[PDB]
């Protein structure tokens, strides 16, 4: 087995990805060619891609093909391709393996211009759109917006041309549900690639200064339950301290991190003082607990503290607050885990171990002593204990590190690591146990690497050097090892590393090119032929690479300043190693200050890009196959190994005053200069930008531009003021001068506010470096948006401070709901394609609180469609068994009418093209001849007998009436003859209790008929059967006495079905009742009984059917019992179809489609007819629910408002504000399917 | 210009005294 190959490939193919497949062969000397091909699965017919590769000593018999799966070449449709054949073909070998494929190709980074938005805002939003290759994807993208209730609100589409998809601004609806909204992004047609972002909608006003609350520990232990100590600091959004603030502390019990509201204490509620930006506080938790808790001891509290702080600037008007719920009281507060450790051993090589200590609510503790105890085995299970070892954790990294000089012959190690903090006993000093295992070569053939796991990221463009040491009984054979460098899903470098005459091998001396960032994985492998049997030997290591951009893009203000003045014109420079696009945006730091723990949207970009990597762990493996699988590869080889041993386990180890502006995109032709004016606001603006090119993304460093002023006035205006009340609004002048000066304030306002202060002042002086309270008891008269201004005049200065006050009405913002289902076909009953909604006015409307009206619309989708259809045997079902005696003619033509009806689904006449068409004119002929035949079976009195002189039968009359209901589209029977038939039936055989007892024929017919009941309530069958036929004829002979006979028959059949007669009678009765009052309470009870009697397969039912009468006996051929089964199931089907219960029907259709009990029923005309009727009805129902509904909505006297093209592809248009005070009329074109339309009204009462 | 590159800003304005809706640039 000297001649051997390895083909190595990603564990999973990404659709549309360019995948690099590498091949090595051994024991060959004649140069030869191979082809590596990606082929359809299982049939291998279509070839997606193919690569010819040539192998020779000129290539050291190594090569690669670049192969790709362009997404349109897949068949697509509802069933996407799960699997594809990878193939290799040569003169010497042919093999193929079933690769999995994935449609997850690339990255959709949603960036919203803020994380928080008020109502009455539009979001700016854009999406960065990148391939798996990290190039700008240039693909159509779609956004979907979900409210905090999980209700879809809007969808919008845009076409990428750049990698930067600047979607239209989303106007927040006129009445949003407050809370966490979500944006999802998808490539429209052909990828999963689902991006996500979150944003919060709330009534808020920007904080005027940050409060930062800084406990010394996220946990309280024995050392700090006696006394816990905490720092608080406060700083403006210009980076200067709060000079003085009054502080009120609050403490409380807590029992959950997630969601509890346990009681606050009423002790240590310390009113205290913050100076020079800082307050220092201490809580004696022991005494507070013992005083006011029911707890008295820490051992009762593996639980949490709540802490909150509020503060008010001691010489001003602004106030702020925050909290830190969840400081963990815990007896064992630490936890431990590995980081970057393999758990695989190279013997004799110093084996490194690293551990991270973490907390509950984990941070890097960094300060813990830890110690290690270990036991080993080398050979024949000689259990050998190691000497213990000790490290501190690193204070910054958290890492405690160890290295074990294990025996040169060690086979396994298992060990414990425990916290050695002398203050914690081992019941408290957190501890863990772990096992590592050797590579388990059969050939004792190994390939170790001289890698210490250098903790420090490799810098881009350095040469990595790794010496590599195969060790083997057969090293003389091992001419070269082969190496692969993989990044993310993809092999990016491959090569060969020759043995020197030193009996050692060329190291991997390679540049870490930019494509390797942030992480790459090195796998080295060889095949050694052994004595006769080949073995693939491999090892791999994760290589951490410096995070660096390919563009090296940099951005800076060219007129650099520590702080700029408001409105200052500035110049900005963008410089790059190559021509690039760049997006820019600016956002105020108070915005992020709004939300505790807010995230910068371009955070984690590299760690998110790393989620693309298919591997897990830091390297190594229990085996060659395990090494490749953990490396994220798979391989085809004859060298006695296969990756089918392993599976994709969930491996998860650890390794003007705007809010926003400058929201733009620009080209930078290697360099660009911009000139622009700053806003009038005072803050740190954070200016952030993202470079994009065919070289990929870069995120630039955030330029924090300060805008500042030494003397100014500010006002703590709340988000809205309730109309008609007066409130003392508070604020303060600030002096950051060395000296005090006199100031004066002369507030002015639009007449929408008139207030008794009537803003010659006190002309107070602020002290130097101090603030002075300013207050106004403004009393708003008029609702809405009103300009208020705080003009100020002062010694050596003036200031202007325009504002818009929002005034909101008194009372309660109550909401009310109304809506309907649009049903332009009457699937549920009354055709309902118009509705009207007057502008109704509540009797408790407050006189000025004009009612807000909002519209919403939903499409209702078909769901699962099960393509149950006839075989080509429809030819036979038409050409049916020879016409003749026993009314073989009747039994032949009776299916013809129903096959006709079935094809009058239309599809099957529109398309038979898999097979030669049924000739439509042949069908029409056959139908006509059928009508001619069926006339021959009418009795003179319009009863029916199969024999011309035979006994008249109500049974056959009802059958005829059913048939004659169908035919009328081509051949109506004269209504008089139908009326005569019905009249004769009802007038002779209506009865006082039960009905339609068969008149004069006790002799059954087998293939035309079906099993009667036992005499007990056998009338149920007759009543049901006759009812069915009558209802199918009733639309062509309405007669009030017949209606009365229906009502009677239904009453009797119901009253006789209440005792749950044997299930066939129940099923046929339920089918009869589904023709009647579909909402009759007892009908619905009988349906519930039918549903309880169903049989199913699978917990979610895949198949559903009914058995009775020991039909669980075997039947390999159709028979009376299989007939009973097929008919009773077809009746349950038709019942549920009349309830339109598609979701319940589906597993019935599937079970029918199987034809289990093969051949069907007894091949009666009954079972076959009723089955094909049910299948026809289903086929109809699917097209009925198919959504196409062009809604139009207009006011009554005022004009049209809006139109919705509600369609399967666009099933949900945005909600619309119903602005105008007129009656609203909504309607639709006839179209198809179902919708629901709502209007809701908000009124302040 | 006969065409406007994406993200570059045009300017459109009518003569004095006319009233005009919509933005001064379209993208």
């Amino acid at each position: 087995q000297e001649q051997t190959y390895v083909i190595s490939a990603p564990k999973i193919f990404r659709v549309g990805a360019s995948e690099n497949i590498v091949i090595q062969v051994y024991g060959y000397t004649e140069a030869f060619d191979a082809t590596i091909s990606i082929k359809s699965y299982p049939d291998k017919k279509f070839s997606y891609s193919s690569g010819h590769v040539h192998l020779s000593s000129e290539n050291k018999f190594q090569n690669s093909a670049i192969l790709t799966i362009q997404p349109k070449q897949l068949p697509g449709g509802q069933n996407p391709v799960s699997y594809v054949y990878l193939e290799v073909v040569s003169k010497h070998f042919s093999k193929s393996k079933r690769m999995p494929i994935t449609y997850d190709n690339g990255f959709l980074f949603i960036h919203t211009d803020k994380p928080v938005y008020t109502p009455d805002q539009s979001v700016k939003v854009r999406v960065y759109s990148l391939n798996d290759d990290l190039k700008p994807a240039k693909r159509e993208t779609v956004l979907t917006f979900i409210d905090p209730e999980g209700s879809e609100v809007d969808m919008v589409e845009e076409i990428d041309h750049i990698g930067i998809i600047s979607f239209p601004d989303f106007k927040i609806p006129s009445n949003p549900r407050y809370g966490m909204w979500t944006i999802k992004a998808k490539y429209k047609e052909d990828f999963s690639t689902t991006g996500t972002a979150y944003f919060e909608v709330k009534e808020y006003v920007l904080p005027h200064f940050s409060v930062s609350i800084e406990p010394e520990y996220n946990f309280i232990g024995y050392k700090n339950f006696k006394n816990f100590e905490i720092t608080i600091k406060a700083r403006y959004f210009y980076n200067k301290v709060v000079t003085e603030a009054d502080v009120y502390i609050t403490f409380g019990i807590r029992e959950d991190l997630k969601d509890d509201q346990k009681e606050m204490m009423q002790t240590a509620m310390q009113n205290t003082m913050l100076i020079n930006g800082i307050a220092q506080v201490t809580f004696d938790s022991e005494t507070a607990v013992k005083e006011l808790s029911y707890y008295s001891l820490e051992d009762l509290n593996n639980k949490y503290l709540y802490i909150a702080v509020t503060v008010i600037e001691s010489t001003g008007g602004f106030s702020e607050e925050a909290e830190i719920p969840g400081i963990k009281y815990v007896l064992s507060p630490y936890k431990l885990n590995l980081v970057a450790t393999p758990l695989f051993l190279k013997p004799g090589i110093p084996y490194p171990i690293k551990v991270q200590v973490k907390d509950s609510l984990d941070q890097l503790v960094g300060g813990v002593p830890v110690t290690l105890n270990a036991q080993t085995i080398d050979v024949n299970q000689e259990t050998s204990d190691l000497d213990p070892s000790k490290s501190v954790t690193r204070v910054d990294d958290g890492v405690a590190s160890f290295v074990l000089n294990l025996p040169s012959g060690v086979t396994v190690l298992e060990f414990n690591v425990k916290t050695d903090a002398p203050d914690l006993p081992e019941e408290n000093q957190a501890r863990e146990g772990y096992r590592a295992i050797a590579y388990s070569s059969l050939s004792q053939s190994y390939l170790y690497i001289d890698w210490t796991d250098n903790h420090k990221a490799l810098l881009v463009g350095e040469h990595l050097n790794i010496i590599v040491t195969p060790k083997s009984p057969y090293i003389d054979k091992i001419t070269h090892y082969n190496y692969l460098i993989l990044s993310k899903g993809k092999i990016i470098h491959f090569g060969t590393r020759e043995k020197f005459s030193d009996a050692s091998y060329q190291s991997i001396n390679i540049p870490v090119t930019q494509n390797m960032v942030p992480s790459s994985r090195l796998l080295v492998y060889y095949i050694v032929t052994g004595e006769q049997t080949a073995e693939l030997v491999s090892d791999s290591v994760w290589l951490n690479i410096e995070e660096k951009c390919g563009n090296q893009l940099q951005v800076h203000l060219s007129p650099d300043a520590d702080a700029y003045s408001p409105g200052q014109t500035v110049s900005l420079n963008m410089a790059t190693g190559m021509d690039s696009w760049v997006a820019l945006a600016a956002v105020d730091s108070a915005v992020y200050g709004v939300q505790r723990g807010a995230k910068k949207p371009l955070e984690r970009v590299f760690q998110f890009l790393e989620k693309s990597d298919l591997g897990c762990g830091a390297g190594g493996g229990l085996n060659n196959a395990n090494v490749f699988h953990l490396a994220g590869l798979t391989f085809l080889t004859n060298a006695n190994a296969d990756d089918s041993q392993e599976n994709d386990e969930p491996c998860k180890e650890i390794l003007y005053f705007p809010e926003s502006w400058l929201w733009e995109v620009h080209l930078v032709p290697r360099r660009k200069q911009l000139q622009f004016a700053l806003p009038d606001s005072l803050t740190t603006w954070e200016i952030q930008g993202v470079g994009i090119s065919n070289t990929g993304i870069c995120v630039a460093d955030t330029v924090k531009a300060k805008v500042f002023k030494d003397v100014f006035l500010e006002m703590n205006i709340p988000y809205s003021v309730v109309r008609g009340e007066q409130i003392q609004l508070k604020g303060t002048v600030y002096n950051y001068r060395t000296s005090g000066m006199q100031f004066c304030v002369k507030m002015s306002a639009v007449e929408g506010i008139c207030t008794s202060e009537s803003p010659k002042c006190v002309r107070q002086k602020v002290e130097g470096s101090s603030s002075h309270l300013v207050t106004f008891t403004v009393l708003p008269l008029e609702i809405g948006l009103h300009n208020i201004n705080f003009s100020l005049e002062t010694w050596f200065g003036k200031e202007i401070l325009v504002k818009t006050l929002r005034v909101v009405p008194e009372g309660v913002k109550r909401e009310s709901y109304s809506g309907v289902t649009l049903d332009p076909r009457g699937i549920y009953g009354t055709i309902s394609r118009r509705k009207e909604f007057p502008y109704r006015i509540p009797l408790d409307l407050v006189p000025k609180t004009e009612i807000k009206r909002i519209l919403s619309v939903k499409g209702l989708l078909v769901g699962e469609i099960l393509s149950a259809v006839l075989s080509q045997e429809g030819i036979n079902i038409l050409t049916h068994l020879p016409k003749g005696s026993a009314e073989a003619e009747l039994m032949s033509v009776v299916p013809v009418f129903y096959v006709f009806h079935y094809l009058e689904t239309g599809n099957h006449w529109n398309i038979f093209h898999s097979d030669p068409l049924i000739e439509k004119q042949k069908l029409k002929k056959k139908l006509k001849e059928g009508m001619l035949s069926i006339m021959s079976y009418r009795n003179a009195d319009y009863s029916y007998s199969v024999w011309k002189g035979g006994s008249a039968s109500t049974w056959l009359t009802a059958f005829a009436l059913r048939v004659l209901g169908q035919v009328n589209k081509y051949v109506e029977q004269n209504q008089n003859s139908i009326c005569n038939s019905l009249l004769w039936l009802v007038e002779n055989y209506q009865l006082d209790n039960g009905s339609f007892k068969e008149n004069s024929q006790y002799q059954p017919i087998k293939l035309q008929g079906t099993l009667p009941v036992e005499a007990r309530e056998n009338s149920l069958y007759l009543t049901a059967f006759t009812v069915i036929g009558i209802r199918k004829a009733f639309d062509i002979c309405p007669l009030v006495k017949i209606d009365t006979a229906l009502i009677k028959a239904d009453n009797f059949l119901l009253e006789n079905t209440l005792p749950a007669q044997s299930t066939f009678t129940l099923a046929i009765s339920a089918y009869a009742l589904s023709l009647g009052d579909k909402t009759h309470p007892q009908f619905r009870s009988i349906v519930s009984a039918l549903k309880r009697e169903a049989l199913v397969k699978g917990n979610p039912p895949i198949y559903r059917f009914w058995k009775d009468n020991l039909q669980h006996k075997d039947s390999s051929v159709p028979n009376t019992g299989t007939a009973r089964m097929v008919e009773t199931t077809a009746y349950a089907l038709l019942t549920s179809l009349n309830l339109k219960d598609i979701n319940y029907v589906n597993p019935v259709i599937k079970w029918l489609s199987e034809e289990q009990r093969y051949g069907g029923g007894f091949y009666s005309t009954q079972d076959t007819i009723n089955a094909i009727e049910g299948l026809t009805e289903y086929s109809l129902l699917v097209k009925q629910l198919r959504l196409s509904m062009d809604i139009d909505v207009s006011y009554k006297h005022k004009g049209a408002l809006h139109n919705y093209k509600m369609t399967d592809k666009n099933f949900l248009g945005r909600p619309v504000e119903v602005l105008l005070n007129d009656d609203l009329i909504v309607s639709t074109g006839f179209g198809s399917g179902l919708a629901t339309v709502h209007v809701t009204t908000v009124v302040h009462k | 210009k006969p065409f406007y590159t994406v993200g570059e800003k045009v300017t459109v304005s009518c003569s004095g005294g006319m009233s005009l809706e919509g933005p001064s640039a379209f993208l």
């Binding site: 209700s151 109304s818 009052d1077 909402t1079 | -």
Partner: protein, 49 residues
């Protein structure tokens, strides 16, 4: 998945479209029995809890 289980209809109400489970943001329509008329807003909407 904590999708809402099927609600019990009100007295003299019934569900037009029964299912084992309803999606979050799915709505269900009640309707009245043959002898009864709806008063009030006939939809229930499945919340995340």
């Amino acid at each position: 998945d904590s999708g809402c289980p099927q609600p019990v209809p009100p007295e003299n109400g019934f569900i037009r479209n029964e299912k084992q489970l309803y999606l979050v943001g799915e709505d269900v329509e009640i309707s009245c029995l043959t002898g009864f008329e709806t008063v009030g807003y006939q939809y229930f909407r499945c919340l995340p809890d």
